[PDB]
Coordinates of C-alpha atoms in Angstrom, one line a residue:
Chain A
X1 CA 12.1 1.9 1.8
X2 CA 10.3 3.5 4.8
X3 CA 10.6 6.5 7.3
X4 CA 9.1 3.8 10.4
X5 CA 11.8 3.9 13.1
X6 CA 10.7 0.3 14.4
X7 CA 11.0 -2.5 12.7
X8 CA 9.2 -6.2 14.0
X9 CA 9.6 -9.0 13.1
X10 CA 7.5 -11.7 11.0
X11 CA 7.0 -14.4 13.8
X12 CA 6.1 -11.1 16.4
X13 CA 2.8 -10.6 13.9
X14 CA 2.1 -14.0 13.6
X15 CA 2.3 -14.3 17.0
X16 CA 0.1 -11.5 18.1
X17 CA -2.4 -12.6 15.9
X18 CA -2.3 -15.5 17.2
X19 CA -2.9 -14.4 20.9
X20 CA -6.1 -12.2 19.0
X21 CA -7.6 -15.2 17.7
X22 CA -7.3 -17.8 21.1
X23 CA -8.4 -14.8 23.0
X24 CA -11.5 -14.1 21.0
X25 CA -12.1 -17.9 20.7
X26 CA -12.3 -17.9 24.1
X27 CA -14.3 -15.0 24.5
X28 CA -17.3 -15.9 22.3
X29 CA -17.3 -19.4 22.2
X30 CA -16.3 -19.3 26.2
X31 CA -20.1 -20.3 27.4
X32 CA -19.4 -23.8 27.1
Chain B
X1 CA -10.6 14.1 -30.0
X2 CA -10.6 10.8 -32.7
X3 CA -6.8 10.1 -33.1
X4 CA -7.3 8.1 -29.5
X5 CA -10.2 6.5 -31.2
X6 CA -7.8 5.7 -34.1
X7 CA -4.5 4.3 -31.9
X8 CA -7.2 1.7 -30.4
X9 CA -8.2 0.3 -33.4
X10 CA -4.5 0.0 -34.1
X11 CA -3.4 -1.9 -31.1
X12 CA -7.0 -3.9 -31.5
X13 CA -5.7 -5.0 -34.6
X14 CA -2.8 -6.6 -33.0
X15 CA -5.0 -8.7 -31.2
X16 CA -3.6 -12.2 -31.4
X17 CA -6.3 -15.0 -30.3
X18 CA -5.5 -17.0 -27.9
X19 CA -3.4 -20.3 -29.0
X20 CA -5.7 -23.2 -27.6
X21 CA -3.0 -24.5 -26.1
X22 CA -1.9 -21.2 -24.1
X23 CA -5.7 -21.3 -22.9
X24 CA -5.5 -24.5 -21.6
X25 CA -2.3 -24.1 -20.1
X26 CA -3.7 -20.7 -18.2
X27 CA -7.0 -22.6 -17.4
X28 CA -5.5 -25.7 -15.8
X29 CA -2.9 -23.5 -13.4
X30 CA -5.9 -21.2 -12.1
X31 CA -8.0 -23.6 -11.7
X32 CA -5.7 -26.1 -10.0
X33 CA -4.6 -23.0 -7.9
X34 CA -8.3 -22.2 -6.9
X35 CA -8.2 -25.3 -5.7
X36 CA -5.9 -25.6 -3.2
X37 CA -7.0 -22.6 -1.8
X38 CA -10.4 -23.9 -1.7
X39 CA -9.4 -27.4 -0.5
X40 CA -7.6 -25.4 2.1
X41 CA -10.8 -23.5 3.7
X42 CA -12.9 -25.7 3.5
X43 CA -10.4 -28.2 5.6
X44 CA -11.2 -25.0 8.2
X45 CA -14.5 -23.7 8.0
X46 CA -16.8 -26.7 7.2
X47 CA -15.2 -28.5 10.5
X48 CA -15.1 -25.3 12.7
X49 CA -18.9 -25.3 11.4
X50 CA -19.8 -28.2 12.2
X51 CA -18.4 -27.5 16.1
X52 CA -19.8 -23.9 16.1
X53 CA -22.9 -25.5 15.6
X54 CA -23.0 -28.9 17.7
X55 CA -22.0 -27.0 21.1
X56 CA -24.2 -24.0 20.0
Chain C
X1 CA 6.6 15.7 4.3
X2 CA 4.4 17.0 6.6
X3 CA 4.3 13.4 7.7
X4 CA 7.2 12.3 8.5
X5 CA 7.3 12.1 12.3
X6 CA 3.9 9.9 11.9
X7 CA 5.3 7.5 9.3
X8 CA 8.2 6.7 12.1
X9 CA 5.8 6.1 14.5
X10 CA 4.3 3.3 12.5
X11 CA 5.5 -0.7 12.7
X12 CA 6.6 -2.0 9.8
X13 CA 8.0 -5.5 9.7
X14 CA 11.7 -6.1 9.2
X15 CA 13.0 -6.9 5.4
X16 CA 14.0 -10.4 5.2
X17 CA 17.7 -10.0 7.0
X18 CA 18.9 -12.4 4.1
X19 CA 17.2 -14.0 0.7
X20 CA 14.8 -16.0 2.0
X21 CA 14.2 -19.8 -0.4
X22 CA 10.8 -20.0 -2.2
X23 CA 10.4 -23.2 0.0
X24 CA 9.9 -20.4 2.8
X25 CA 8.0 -17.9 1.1
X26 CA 5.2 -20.7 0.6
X27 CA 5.4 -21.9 4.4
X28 CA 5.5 -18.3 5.3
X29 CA 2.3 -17.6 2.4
X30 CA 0.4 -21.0 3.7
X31 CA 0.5 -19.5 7.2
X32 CA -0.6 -16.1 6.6
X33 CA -3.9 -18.0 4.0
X34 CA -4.5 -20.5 7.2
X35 CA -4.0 -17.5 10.1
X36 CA -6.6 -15.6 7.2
X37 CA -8.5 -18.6 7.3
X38 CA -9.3 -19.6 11.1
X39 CA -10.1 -16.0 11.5
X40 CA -13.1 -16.5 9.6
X41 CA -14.4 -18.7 11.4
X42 CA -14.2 -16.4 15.0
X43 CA -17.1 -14.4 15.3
X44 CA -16.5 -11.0 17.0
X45 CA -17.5 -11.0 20.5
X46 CA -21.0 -9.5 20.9
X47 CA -23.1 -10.8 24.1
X48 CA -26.0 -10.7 21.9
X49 CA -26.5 -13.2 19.1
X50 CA -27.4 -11.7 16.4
X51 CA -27.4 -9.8 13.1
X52 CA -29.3 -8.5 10.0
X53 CA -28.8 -11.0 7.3
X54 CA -26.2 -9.5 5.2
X55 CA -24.9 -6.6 3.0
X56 CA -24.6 -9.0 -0.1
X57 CA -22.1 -7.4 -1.7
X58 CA -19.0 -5.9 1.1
X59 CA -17.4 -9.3 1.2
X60 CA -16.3 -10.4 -1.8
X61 CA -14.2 -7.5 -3.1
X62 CA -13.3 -7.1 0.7
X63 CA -12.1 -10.7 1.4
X64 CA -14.2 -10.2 4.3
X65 CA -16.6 -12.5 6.0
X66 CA -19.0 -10.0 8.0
X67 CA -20.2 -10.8 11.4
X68 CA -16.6 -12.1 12.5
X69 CA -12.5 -11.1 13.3
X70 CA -12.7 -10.5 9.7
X71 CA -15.4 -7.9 9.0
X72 CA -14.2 -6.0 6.9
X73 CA -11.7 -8.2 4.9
X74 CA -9.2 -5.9 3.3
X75 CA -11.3 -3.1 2.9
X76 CA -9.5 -0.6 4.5
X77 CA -6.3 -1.2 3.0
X78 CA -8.4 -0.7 -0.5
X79 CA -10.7 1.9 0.3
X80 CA -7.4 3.5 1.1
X81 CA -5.8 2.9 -2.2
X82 CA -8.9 4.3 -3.5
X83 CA -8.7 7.7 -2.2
X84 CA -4.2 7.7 -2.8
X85 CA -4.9 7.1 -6.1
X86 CA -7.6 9.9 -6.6
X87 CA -5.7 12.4 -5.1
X88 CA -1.9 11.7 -7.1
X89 CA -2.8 10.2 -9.8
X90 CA -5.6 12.9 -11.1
X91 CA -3.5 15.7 -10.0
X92 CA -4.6 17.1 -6.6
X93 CA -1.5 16.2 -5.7
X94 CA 2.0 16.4 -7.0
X95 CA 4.9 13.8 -6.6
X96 CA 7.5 12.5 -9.5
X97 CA 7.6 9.0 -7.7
X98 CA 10.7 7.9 -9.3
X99 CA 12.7 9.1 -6.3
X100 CA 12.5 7.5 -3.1
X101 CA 11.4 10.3 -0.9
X102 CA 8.0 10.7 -2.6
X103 CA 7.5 6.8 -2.8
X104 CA 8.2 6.2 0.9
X105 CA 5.5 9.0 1.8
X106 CA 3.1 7.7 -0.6
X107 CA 3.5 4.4 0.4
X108 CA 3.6 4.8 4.0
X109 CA 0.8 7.5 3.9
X110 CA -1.8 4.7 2.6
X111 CA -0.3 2.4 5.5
X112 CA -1.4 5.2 7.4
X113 CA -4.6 5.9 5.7
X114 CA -5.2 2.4 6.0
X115 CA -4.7 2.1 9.9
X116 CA -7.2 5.0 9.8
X117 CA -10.1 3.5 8.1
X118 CA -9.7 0.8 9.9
X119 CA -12.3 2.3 12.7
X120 CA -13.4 4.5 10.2
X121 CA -15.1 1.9 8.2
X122 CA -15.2 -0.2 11.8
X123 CA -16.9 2.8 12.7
X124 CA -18.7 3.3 9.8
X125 CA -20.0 -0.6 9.8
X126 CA -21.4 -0.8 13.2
X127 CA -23.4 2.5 12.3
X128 CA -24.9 0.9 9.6
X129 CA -26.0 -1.3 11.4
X130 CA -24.3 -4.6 10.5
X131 CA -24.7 -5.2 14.4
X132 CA -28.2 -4.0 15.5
X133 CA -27.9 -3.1 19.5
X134 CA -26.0 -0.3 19.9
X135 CA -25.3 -0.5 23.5
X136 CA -22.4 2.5 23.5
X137 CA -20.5 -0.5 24.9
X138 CA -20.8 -3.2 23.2
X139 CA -20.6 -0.7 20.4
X140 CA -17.1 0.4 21.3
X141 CA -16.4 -2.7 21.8
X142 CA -16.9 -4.5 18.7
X143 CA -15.4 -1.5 16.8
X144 CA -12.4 -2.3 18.5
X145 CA -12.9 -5.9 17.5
X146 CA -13.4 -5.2 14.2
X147 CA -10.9 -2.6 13.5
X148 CA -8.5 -4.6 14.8
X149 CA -8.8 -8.0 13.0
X150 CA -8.4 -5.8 10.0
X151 CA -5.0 -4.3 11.1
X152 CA -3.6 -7.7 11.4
X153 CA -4.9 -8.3 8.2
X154 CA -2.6 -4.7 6.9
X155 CA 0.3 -6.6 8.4
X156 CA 0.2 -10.1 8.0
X157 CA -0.2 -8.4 3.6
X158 CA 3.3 -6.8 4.9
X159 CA 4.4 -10.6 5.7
X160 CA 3.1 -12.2 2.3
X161 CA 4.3 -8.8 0.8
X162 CA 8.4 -9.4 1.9
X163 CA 8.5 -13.3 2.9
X164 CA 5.5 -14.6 0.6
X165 CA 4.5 -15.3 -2.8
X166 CA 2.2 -12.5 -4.1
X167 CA 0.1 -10.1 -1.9
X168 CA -1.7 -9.8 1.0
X169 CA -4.5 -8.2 -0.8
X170 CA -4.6 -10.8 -3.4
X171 CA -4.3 -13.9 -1.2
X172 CA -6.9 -13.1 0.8
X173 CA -9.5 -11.7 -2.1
X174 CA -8.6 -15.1 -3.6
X175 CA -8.3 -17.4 -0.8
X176 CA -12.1 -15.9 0.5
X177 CA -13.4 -16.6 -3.2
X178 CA -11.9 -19.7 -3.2
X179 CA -13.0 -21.0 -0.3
X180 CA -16.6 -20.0 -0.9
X181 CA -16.9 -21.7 -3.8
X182 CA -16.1 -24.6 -2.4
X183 CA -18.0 -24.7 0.5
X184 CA -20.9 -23.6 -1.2
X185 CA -20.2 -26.1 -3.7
X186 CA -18.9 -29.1 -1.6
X187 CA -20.1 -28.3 1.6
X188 CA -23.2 -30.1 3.3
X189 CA -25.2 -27.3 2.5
X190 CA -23.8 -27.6 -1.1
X191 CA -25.2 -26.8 -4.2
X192 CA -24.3 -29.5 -6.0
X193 CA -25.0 -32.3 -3.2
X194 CA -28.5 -30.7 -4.0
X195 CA -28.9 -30.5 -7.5
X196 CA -27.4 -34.5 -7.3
X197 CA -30.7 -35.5 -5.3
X198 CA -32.6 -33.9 -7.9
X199 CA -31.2 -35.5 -10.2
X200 CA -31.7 -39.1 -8.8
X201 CA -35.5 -37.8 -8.5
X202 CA -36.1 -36.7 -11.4
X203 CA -37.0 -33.3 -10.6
X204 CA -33.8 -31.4 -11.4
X205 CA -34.3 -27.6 -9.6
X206 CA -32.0 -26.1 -12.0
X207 CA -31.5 -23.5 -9.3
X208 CA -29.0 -25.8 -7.4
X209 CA -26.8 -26.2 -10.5
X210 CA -27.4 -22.7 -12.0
X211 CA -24.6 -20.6 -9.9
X212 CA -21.9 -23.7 -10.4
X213 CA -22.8 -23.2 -14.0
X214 CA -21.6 -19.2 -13.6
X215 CA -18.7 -19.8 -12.0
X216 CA -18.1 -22.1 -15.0
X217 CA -18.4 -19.8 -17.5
X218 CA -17.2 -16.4 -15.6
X219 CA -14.3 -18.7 -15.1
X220 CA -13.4 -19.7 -18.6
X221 CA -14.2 -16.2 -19.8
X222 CA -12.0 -14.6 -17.6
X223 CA -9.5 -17.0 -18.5
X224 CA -9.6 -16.3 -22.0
X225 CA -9.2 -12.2 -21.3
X226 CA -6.2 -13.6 -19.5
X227 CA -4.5 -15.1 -22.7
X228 CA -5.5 -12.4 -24.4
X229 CA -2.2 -10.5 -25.9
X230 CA -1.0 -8.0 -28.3
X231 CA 2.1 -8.7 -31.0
X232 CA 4.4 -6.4 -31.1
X233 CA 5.9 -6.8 -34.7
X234 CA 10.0 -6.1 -35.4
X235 CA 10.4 -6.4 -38.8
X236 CA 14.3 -4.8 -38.6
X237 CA 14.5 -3.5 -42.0
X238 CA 17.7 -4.4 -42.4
X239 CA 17.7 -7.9 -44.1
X240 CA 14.7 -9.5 -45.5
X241 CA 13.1 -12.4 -43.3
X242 CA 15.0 -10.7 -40.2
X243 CA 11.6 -10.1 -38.7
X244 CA 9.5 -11.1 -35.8
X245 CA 6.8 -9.8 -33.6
X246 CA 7.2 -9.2 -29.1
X247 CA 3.7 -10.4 -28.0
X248 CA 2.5 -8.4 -24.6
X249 CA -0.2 -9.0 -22.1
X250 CA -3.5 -6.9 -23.5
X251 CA -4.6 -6.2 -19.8
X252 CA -1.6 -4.2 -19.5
X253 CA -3.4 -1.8 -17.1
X254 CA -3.9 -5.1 -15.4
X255 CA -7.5 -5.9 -13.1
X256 CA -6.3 -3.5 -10.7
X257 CA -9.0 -1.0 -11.7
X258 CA -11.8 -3.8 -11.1
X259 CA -10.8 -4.5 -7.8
X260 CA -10.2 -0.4 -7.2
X261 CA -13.5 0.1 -8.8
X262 CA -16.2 -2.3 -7.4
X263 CA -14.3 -1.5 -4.0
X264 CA -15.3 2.1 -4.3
X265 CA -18.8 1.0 -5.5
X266 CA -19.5 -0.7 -2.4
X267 CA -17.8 1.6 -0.1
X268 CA -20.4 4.1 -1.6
X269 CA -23.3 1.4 -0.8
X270 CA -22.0 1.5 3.3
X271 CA -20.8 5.4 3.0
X272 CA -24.6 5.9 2.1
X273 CA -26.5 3.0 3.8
X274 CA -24.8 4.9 6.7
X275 CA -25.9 8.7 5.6
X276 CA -29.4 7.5 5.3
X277 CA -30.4 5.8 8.8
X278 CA -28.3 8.4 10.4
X279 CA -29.9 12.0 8.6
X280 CA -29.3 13.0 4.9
X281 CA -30.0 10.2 2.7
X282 CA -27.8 11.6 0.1
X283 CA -26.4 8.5 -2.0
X284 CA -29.8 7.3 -1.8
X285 CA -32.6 5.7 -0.4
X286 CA -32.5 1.8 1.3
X287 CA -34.6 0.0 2.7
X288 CA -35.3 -4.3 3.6
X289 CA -32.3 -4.5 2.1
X290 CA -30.3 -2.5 0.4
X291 CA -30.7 1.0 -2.1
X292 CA -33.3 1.0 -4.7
X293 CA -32.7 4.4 -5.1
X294 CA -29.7 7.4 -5.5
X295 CA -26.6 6.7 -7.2
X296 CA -26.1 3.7 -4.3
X297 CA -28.7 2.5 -6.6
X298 CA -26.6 3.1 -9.8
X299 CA -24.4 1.6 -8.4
X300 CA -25.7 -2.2 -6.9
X301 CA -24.9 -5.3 -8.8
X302 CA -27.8 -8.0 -8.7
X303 CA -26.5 -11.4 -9.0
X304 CA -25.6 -14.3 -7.2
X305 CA -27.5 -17.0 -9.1
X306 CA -28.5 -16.3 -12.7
X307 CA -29.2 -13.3 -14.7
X308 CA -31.6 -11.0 -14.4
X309 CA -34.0 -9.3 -16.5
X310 CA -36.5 -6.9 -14.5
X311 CA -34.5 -3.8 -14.8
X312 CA -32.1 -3.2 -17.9
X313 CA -31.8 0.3 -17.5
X314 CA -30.0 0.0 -14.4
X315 CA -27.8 -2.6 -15.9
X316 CA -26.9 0.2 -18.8
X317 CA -26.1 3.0 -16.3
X318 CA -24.1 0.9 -14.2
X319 CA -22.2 -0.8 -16.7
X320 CA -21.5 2.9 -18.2
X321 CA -20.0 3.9 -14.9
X322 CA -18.2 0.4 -14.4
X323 CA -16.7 1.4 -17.5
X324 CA -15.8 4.4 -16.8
X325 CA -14.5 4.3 -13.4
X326 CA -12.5 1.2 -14.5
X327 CA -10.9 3.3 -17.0
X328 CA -10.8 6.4 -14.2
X329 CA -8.5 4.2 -12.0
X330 CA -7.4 2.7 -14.6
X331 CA -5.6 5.8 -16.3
X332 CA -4.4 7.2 -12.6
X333 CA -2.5 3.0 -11.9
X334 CA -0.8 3.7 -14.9
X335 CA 0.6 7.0 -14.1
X336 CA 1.2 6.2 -10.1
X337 CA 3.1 2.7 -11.0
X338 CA 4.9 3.3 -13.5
X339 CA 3.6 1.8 -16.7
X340 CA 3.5 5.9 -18.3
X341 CA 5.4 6.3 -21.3
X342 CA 7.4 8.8 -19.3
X343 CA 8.9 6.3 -17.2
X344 CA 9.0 3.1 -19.4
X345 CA 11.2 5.1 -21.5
X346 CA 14.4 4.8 -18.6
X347 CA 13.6 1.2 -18.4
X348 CA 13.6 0.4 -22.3
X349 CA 16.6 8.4 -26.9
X350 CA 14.6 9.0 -24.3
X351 CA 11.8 11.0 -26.1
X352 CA 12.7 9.4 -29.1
X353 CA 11.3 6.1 -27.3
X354 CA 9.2 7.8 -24.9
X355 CA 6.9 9.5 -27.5
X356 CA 7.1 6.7 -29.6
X357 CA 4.8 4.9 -26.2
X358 CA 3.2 8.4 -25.6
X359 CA 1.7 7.6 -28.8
X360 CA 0.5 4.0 -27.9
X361 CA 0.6 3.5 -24.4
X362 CA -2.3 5.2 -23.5
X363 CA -5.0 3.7 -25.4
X364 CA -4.2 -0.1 -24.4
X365 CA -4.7 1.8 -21.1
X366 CA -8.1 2.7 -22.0
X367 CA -8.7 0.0 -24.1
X368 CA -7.3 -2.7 -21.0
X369 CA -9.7 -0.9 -18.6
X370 CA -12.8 -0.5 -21.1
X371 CA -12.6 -4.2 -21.4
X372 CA -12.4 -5.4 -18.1
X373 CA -14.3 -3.3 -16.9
X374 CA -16.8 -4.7 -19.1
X375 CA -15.9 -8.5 -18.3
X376 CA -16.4 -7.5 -14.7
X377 CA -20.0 -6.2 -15.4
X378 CA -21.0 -8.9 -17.6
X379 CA -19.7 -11.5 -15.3
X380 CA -21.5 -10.0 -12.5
X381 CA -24.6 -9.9 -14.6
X382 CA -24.1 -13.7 -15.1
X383 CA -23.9 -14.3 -11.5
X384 CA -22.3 -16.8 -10.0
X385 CA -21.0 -19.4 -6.7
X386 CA -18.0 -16.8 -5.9
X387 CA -19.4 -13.5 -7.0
X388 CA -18.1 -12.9 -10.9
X389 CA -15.8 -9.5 -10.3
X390 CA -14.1 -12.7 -7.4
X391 CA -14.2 -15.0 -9.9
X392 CA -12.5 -13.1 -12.1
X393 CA -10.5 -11.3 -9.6
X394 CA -9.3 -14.5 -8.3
X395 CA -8.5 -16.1 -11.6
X396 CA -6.3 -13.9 -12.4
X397 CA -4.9 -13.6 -9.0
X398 CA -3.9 -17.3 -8.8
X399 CA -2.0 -16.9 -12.3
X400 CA 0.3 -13.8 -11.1
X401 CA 0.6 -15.9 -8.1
X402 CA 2.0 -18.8 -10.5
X403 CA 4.2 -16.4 -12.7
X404 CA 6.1 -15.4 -9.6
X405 CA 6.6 -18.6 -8.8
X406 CA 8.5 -19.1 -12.0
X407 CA 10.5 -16.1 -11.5
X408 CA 11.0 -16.8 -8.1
X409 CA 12.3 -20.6 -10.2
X410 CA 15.0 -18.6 -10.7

């Protein structure tokens, strides 16, 4: 086990990642 | 200082060569494995390329 | 212990609340290969378009793709094994392991150390150069990029670690090899396309069918090494014929120490690539390129093609230290998992056992490492469409991938 006092969950990573990767998209391949 | 040197050759005594059968069976679950992972990136990055590339 | 209050302040996704159906741990495994996948193809943003070929030789261990969200693959999280596994497993520092306190601070002091390198070796990359304009900006900015793709990448391994099949580490070392192959293979840039044309015009450029050859034979090679086993015998000298023989994998030390290994290699080649176009060019001396000369020179693998044959005393000096080092990290895994005769005995009196492995155990270590370390030089000597040490790595990835599959049949 682990001393971390927060736990998140699965979908929460997936998720931010998710934002990370439509916001860079956007970002670099923005110009058109 | 040599019994180390000794102990090996023991254990590489006890090498057992491969059963061709075993080999096969190892080879053709890699492989296939390798595969789907491969099938599975390429599915992404040749068509992302291809974009990537045609706006650019 | 020291720690402590850090290690709270860390995230750490939640153990599944329930068992979770191997069904799941696939869907939640493709998702975390595909997530690893379409971040490969983002580049990080950079207003200027543009970079200096390519380190040949940071992806591949790193299940990195440099230039993009995933810059520097898994390195991190390695790099920080690497330096965990120096200091306990030598000795520099002290910890029995079998009881949960030490584990959770080594364990969630290489999370930590991870998150660390992250920038570090963000840090570290841009410096190098892997960039070019170093607009203090821009700079910042991709570090940030950078550093962050690769701390999803710590924690979507957590995902694949708890609701997945296998590892983060391991999927994505694969899954990178993998793919390359393929593309590079099978893509319309590919290889073999090529060598097909020249084969319909009669003027076969072996070199378009030469590195498809090497994954070939890395492949079947490392295969075999993973067949490889060791029989046990139990001859129980009770009754005559009441005999038989436990057969056990030979790698017992496993391909950790390759991956451990040619991951501190080529942290050494950015570590000093970084030294020298900054001041002291300690590790060594590059230039259009990489080294050719220091021990970042000892170091370097040529391949990526075929074999060659313009410098074999290179090839004897690093294969001594591939050796080596493989056995190095080899010995240390041993000790820090928990495949030392010490601790195998509980599992399996005690000393009666225990020295009984004491007087075994240790040379398969050696003799595990010795050999792959080996098999990771020769493949790399080889060369070939995937990179030899990923070849090798990845075959044997997929497989433990399958076992647990079985196990997880059950």
């Amino acid at each position: 086990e682990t001393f971390s006092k927060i736990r998140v969950k699965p979908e929460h990573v997936i998720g931010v990642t998710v934002a990370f990767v439509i916001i860079e998209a956007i970002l670099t391949y923005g110009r058109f | 200082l040599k019994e180390f040197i000794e102990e090996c050759r023991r254990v590489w005594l006890v090498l057992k060569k491969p059963t061709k059968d075993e080999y096969l069976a190892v080879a053709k679950v890699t492989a296939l494995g390798i595969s789907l992972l491969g099938i599975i990136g390429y599915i992404i990055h040749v068509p992302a390329t291809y974009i990537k590339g045609i706006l650019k | 212990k020291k720690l402590i209050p850090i290690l709270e302040k860390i995230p750490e996704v939640e153990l599944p609340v329930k068992e979770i159906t191997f069904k799941e741990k696939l869907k939640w495994t493709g998702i975390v290969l595909v997530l690893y996948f379409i971040m490969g193809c983002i580049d990080v943003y950079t207003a200027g378009a543009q970079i200096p070929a390519i380190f040949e030789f940071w992806q591949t261990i790193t299940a990195s793709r440099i230039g993009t969200l995933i810059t520097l693959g898994i390195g991190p999280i390695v790099t920080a094994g690497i330096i965990m596994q120096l200091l306990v497993g030598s000795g520099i520092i002290q910890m029995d392991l079998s009881i949960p306190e030490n584990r959770a601070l080594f364990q969630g002091c290489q999370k930590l150390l991870s998150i660390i390198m992250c920038f570090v070796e963000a840090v570290l990359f841009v410096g190098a150069g892997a960039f070019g304009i170093l607009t203090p900006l821009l700079a910042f900015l991709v570090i940030i990029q950078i550093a962050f793709g690769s701390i999803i990448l710590i924690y979507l391994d957590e995902i694949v670690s708890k609701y997945g099949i296998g590892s983060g580490i391991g999927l994505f070392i694969a899954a990178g090899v993998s793919q390359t192959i393929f593309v590079g293979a099978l893509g319309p840039e590919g290889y073999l396309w090529k060598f097909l044309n020249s084969l319909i015009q009669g003027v076969p450029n072996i070199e378009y069918i030469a590195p498809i050859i090497g994954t070939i034979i890395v492949f079947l090679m490392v295969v075999y090494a993973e067949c490889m086993r060791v029989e046990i015998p139990l001859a129980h000298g009770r009754i005559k014929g009441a005999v038989g023989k436990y057969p056990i994998k030979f790698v017992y030390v496993s391909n950790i120490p390759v991956i451990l290994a040619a991951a501190l290699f080529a942290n050494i080649q950015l570590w000093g690539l970084a030294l020298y176009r900054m001041g002291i060019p300690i590790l060594g001396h590059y230039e259009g390129g990489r080294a050719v000369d220091g021990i970042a020179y000892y170091l370097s693998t040529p391949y990526g093609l075929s074999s060659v044959i313009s410098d074999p005393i290179h090839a004897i000096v690093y294969m001594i230290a591939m050796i080596i080092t493989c056995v190095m990290f080899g010995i240390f895994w041993v000790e820090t998992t928990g495949l030392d005769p010490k601790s195998m005995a509980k599992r399996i009196s005690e000393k009666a056992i225990e020295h009984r492995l004491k007087r075994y155990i240790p040379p398969l270590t050696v003799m595990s490492s010795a050999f792959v370390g080996f098999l990771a030089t020769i493949a790399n000597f080889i060369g070939a469409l995937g990179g030899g040490t990923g070849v090798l790595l990845t075959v044997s990835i997929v497989y433990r991938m399958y076992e647990q599959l079985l196990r997880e049949r059950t």
